[PDB]
């Protein structure tokens, strides 16, 4: 069952080395893994929502609590963007 919802990703700007929220909105889909094997609710993103110039694509994300680090404040001025890393190259950003 891929249930859609609506959420948000994070670019990120390499003159800065930042990570902000997207203009583009885009929505998520809730999925109950590949075949149930670790009921990981995989949230896959696209560029289905109304975007703001700036044209995306879809990313599939991943909720582990046991493994990715949930970051949903990133210490001084931050408004809330859940970014889950987990320990490689496999760390996303998304805000709401």
Same mark, same amino acid.
């Given at each position: !069952?891929?249930?859609k919802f609506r959420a948000?990703?994070?670019?990120?700007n390499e003159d800065s080395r930042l990570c902000t929220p997207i203009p583009v909105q885009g929505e998520i889909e809730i999925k109950p893994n590949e075949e149930e094997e670790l009921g990981?609710?995989?949230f896959?993103?696209?560029? !289905?929502?109304?975007?703001?110039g700036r044209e995306l694509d879809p990313?599939?994300?991943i909720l582990i609590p046991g493994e990715?680090?949930?970051?949903p404040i990133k210490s001084s001025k931050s408004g809330r963007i859940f970014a889950l890393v987990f320990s490689s190259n496999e760390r996303y950003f998304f805000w709401l």
């Amino acid at each position: !069952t891929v249930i859609k919802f609506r959420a948000g990703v994070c670019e990120y700007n390499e003159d800065s080395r930042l990570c902000t929220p997207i203009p583009v909105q885009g929505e998520i889909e809730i999925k109950p893994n590949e075949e149930e094997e670790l009921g990981f609710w995989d949230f896959e993103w696209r560029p !289905t929502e109304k975007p703001v110039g700036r044209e995306l694509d879809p990313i599939s994300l991943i909720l582990i609590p046991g493994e990715t680090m949930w970051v949903p404040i990133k210490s001084s001025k931050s408004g809330r963007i859940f970014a889950l890393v987990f320990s490689s190259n496999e760390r996303y950003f998304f805000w709401l």
